[PDB]
Design a protein around this nucleic acid. Structure first.
Length: 167
DNA sequence: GAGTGTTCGATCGCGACTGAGGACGAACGCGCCCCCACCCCCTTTTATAGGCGCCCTTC
């Protein structure tokens, strides 16, 4: 997310934009998209914006910066004030099946799973405060990160354990 | 002689006295609607897997 440093009129923005959507009856912000960034932006009336879809923090920064220019180019005093990363998402495959029953048993304090709920096991690591999603096929997803290393780190801690839980 | 005026007794009207009944109200009572307070609710992307609804076709 980033602040454009000014209050804006989304109605005008929606009107001007060639590739954005807005509906106050659905949400108070303009939804804008770009084919170059392929993430989508959320333009609050407050001037706050959200960048999504980006594969990297820079690309998020690049798109958000790219988003901030055109809003300015609409006629607004947009800025790049207070830019920050809000979330990062990662994924990987351990390439081997594991006995979740043992895993949810041995790490109930952190690991969490319910086959009646969702097919993926939810691991909430606190070390670097990371959440992992662990699936019967061995696929894993990590999110809630603001640092890429934490995904690598959270995964470095969890993979050996998983190997120790090989079927 | 005779006629008129006054007062206690007696007689009658009055109101006081006591209770019950009817109507009224005020304290008590009931509940809704008002509002502030506290905190959820909505959206996207990216990844995944289980369950699943609807349609198309065939019976």
């Amino acid at each position: 997310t980033v602040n454009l440093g000014c209050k804006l009129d989304l109605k005008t923005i929606a009107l001007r934009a060639r590739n954005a959507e807005y509906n106050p009856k659905r949400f108070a912000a303009v939804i804008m998209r770009i084919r170059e960034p392929r993430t989508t932006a959320l333009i609050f009336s407050s001037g706050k914006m959200v960048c999504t879809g980006a594969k990297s923090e820079e690309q998020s920064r690049l798109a958000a910066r790219k988003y901030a220019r055109v809003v300015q180019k609409l006629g607004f005093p947009a800025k790049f004030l207070d830019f920050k990363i809000q979330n990062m998402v990662g994924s990987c495959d351990v390439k081997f099946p594991i006995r979740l029953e043992g895993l949810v048993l041995t790490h109930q304090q952190f690991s969490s799973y319910e086959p009646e709920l969702f097919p993926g096991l939810i691991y909430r690591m606190i070390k670097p405060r990371i959440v992992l999603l662990i699936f019967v096929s061995g696929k894993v997803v990590l999110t809630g990160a603001k640092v890429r290393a934490e995904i690598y780190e959270a995964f470095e801690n969890i993979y050996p354990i998983l190997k120790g839980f090989r079927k």
